[PDB]
Ligand binder design. Structure first.
Ligand SMILES: CC[C@@H]1CCCC[C@@]1(O)C(=O)C(=O)N1CCCC[C@H]1C(=O)O[C@H](CCc1ccc(OC)c(OC)c1)c1cccc(OCC(=O)O)c1
Length: 128
């Protein structure tokens, strides 16, 4: 399925080249511009564990997830991955635990040492 395909065929987008964050572009977005550090970014996402269990979806809440990019407001894989996206882009992101919740996890849904899969759609970005 999609998690196997990004694991086996994804692009390593880490600066370290450590395979910690892998990406496949699923829907090509608009033009060339990507968001910059400090931009307010609006996204929709769904996330799943390596055991196949869904853990969250913004679509199910009928509102986007909003954060400021590159400020450590989200897990490392998301600051790294969203920074690569064009407006309107949908991608798949595989996140090894060192770029996600590590050995701690996030109770109750995320266990220790968890590799995470996300589908992410970048809706918009703007400077404040
Ligand atoms: C079950 C996983 C998780 C549980 C908390 C709510 C969100 C959650 O359901 C989830 O799907 C998730 O795993 N997210 C939410 C969408 C962005 C990616 C990821 C996330 O980063 O959530 C953070 C969790 C807290 C956090 C922030 C920064 C960290 O490192 C710098 C970090 O490391 C372990 C952990 C989150 C949750 C809620 C809001 C967030 O930012 C916007 C805001 O603060 O209003 C961010």
């Amino acid at each position: 399925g999609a998690p196997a395909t990004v694991t086996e065929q994804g692009e390593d987008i880490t600066s370290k080249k450590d395979r910690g964050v892998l990406k496949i572009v699923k829907r090509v977005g608009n033009g060339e511009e990507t968001p910059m550090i400090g931009d307010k970014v609006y996204v929709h996402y769904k996330g799943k564990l390596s055991n196949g269990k869904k853990f969250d979806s913004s679509h199910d809440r009928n509102e986007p997830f909003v954060f400021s990019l590159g400020k450590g407001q989200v897990i490392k894989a998301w600051d790294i991955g969203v920074a690569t996206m064009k407006k309107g882009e949908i991608c798949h992101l595989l996140c090894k635990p060192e770029y996600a919740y590590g050995s701690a996890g996030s109770l109750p849904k995320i266990p220790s040492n968890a590799t995470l899969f996300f589908e992410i759609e970048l809706l918009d970005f703007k400077g404040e």
